Amino acid sequence: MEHVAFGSEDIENTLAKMDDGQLDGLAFGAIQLDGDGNILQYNAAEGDITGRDPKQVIGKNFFKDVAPCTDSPEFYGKFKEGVASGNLNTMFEYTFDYQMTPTKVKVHMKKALSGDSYWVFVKRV
Numbered sequence: 017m018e019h020v021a022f023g024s025e026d027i028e029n030t031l032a033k034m035d036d037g038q039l040d041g042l043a044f045g046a047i048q049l050d051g052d053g054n055i056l057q058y059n060a061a062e063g064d065i066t067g068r069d070p071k072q073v074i075g076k077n078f079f080k081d082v083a084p085c086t087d088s089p090e091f092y093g094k095f096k097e098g099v100a101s102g103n104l105n106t107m108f109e110y111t112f113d114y115q116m117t118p119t120k121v122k123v124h125m126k127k128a129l130s131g132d133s134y135w136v137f138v139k140r141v
């Protein structure tokens with residue numbers, strides 16, 4: 017494992033160092049998105065929760081194609097405000113139900129340490 021706790025204060029500094037191999041060692045799901053919603057990285061833990069094959073979702077649009085259940089003011093709306101503002105740090109519960117057994121999760125969205133990239137972290141609740 018990669019020892020990083022969900023919701024740590026400096027999580028973006030810790031994950032700046034990890035390649036896809038390392039992101040697969042996290043105990044929670046991690047998605048890296050550009051400012052458009054396109055998927056840059058998708059770890060193994062997220063695949064275990066949603067059933068998606070990480071390698072097959074890279075390059076798709078998260079809100080339009082892969083996870084349309086998050087295309088709502090409660091998820092996408094917050095993301096788009098964060099991108100626009102250039103700052104984002106929010107945590108909330110959500111239910112993932114597109115093409116899967118409805119699953120309650122905790123979501124943490126936060127701006128990456130890198131210019132136009134944004135993290136989505138997920139864990140079961």
Ligand SMILES: *C(=O)/C=C\c1ccc(O)cc1
Pocket residue numbers: 047062066068082083084085086111112113114
């Ligand atoms: C609603 O969109 C649920 C499904 C889903 C699929 C993949 C990811 O990463 C999140 C949510």
